[PDB]
């Protein structure tokens, strides 16, 4: 199956998922001098006060915290979006060393990791139908750099030892994703895709300008996860990022001057 290794990594994905060479693939490099300020872009609306986390799970390509999305309890609206998008899950991509790990880049700069908060457009009823629409998902992307610790991440990192291998999950209730957001909600936006198979071209990307800082100890715990399942040859879950893809006929818009 697909992965991030030598013989199944991102350069191979197009054989099973030909849209990998498509016209609106993600991630991309954000050239800050080429992105144009759009004064018509509204402030983002992050409404997470009633978010209900359910589970945390190692899925073989990342770890994910899942939320109750059967009601409008944690929604994203405004910004470049038309309508209400419900939070389904968040997950991260990270590197083997601090100078790589993000999927999006900024003037070719790679960050140590990237957080993706995944939401789907309520006008399509369920996430599976949303992934078949060009405006079906909205992913909020947040860069992580290594420095001071992010206190609101510690509850996540402390439970990772209980989901070390592919397939494992645990109860993860009462987690507040507001503790992972930076001060500013200034952002770049462009039309793109899922960054893992099936690479569906269904995402409005909203990438925050301001990174969050996490400690070397916190990211070290990400790097102790395993791609493999319990009992198979241990392969550390590191470098689970797709590189930047061709921008093609797309403009990146900025919400800020
Ligand atoms: C009904 C049967 C046939 N299955 C059809 C379909 O409903 C399957 O159910 C699904 C389908 C898709 C999802 C889903 O969440 N897909 C998106 C996965 C996904 C989300 C976010 C990213 S990233 N790295 O860009 O932020 C990448 C992949 C969840 C459930
Ligand atoms: Zn992702």
Instruction: Enter the CATH topology name.
Output: Carbonic Anhydrase II
Say how many strands there are: 15
Classified by CATH, the class is Alpha Beta
What percentage of amino acids are in beta strands?
25-35%
Count helical runs. Answer: 3
- Ligands and ions found: the ligand CC(C)NC[C@@H](O)COc1ccc(C(=O)NCCc2ccc(S(N)(=O)=O)cc2)cc1, zinc ion
Using the alpha-carbon principal axes, give the shape: globular
Provide the CATH superfamily: Alpha carbonic anhydrase
- N-to-C SSE series? EEEEEEEEEHEHEEEEHE
Approximately how much helix is present in the residues? under 10%
Largest sheet at a glance? 13 strands, mixed
CATH architecture group name: Roll
- Report the structural category: mainly beta
How many separate structural domains? 1
The Cα radius of gyration reads 17 Å
Distance between the termini: 44 Å
């Amino acid at each position: 199956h697909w992965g991030y290794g030598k013989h199944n990594g991102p350069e191979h994905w197009h054989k099973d998922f030909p849209i990998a060479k498509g016209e609106r693939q993600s991630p991309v490099d954000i050239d800050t001098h080429t992105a144009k300020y759009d004064p018509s872009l509204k402030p983002l609306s992050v409404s997470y006060d009633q978010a209900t986390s359910l589970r945390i799970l190692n899925n073989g390509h990342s770890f994910q915290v899942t939320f109750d999305d059967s009601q409008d309890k944690a929604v994203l609206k405004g910004g470049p979006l038309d309508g209400t998008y419900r939070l389904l899950q968040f997950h991260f991509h990270w590197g083997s060393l601090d100078g790589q790990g993000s999927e999006h880049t900024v003037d070719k700069k790679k960050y140590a990791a990237e957080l993706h908060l995944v939401h789907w457009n309520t006008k399509y009823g369920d996430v599976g139908k949303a992934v078949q629409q060009p405006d079906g998902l909205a992913v909020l992307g947040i860069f992580l750099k290594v420095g001071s610790a992010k206190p609101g991440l510690q509850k996540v990192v402390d439970v990772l030892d209980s989901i070390k291998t592919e397939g494992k999950s645990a109860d993860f209730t009462n987690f507040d994703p507001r503790g992972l957001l930076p001060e500013s909600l200034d952002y770049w936006t462009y039309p793109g895709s899922l960054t893992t198979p099936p690479l569906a071209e269904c995402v409005t990307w909203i990438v925050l300008k301001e990174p969050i800082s996490v400690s070397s100890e916190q990211v070290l715990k990400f790097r102790k996860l395993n791609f493999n399942g319990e009992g198979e040859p241990e392969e550390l879950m590191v470098d689970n990022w797709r590189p930047a893809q061709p921008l093609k006929n797309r403009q990146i818009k900025a919400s800020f001057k």
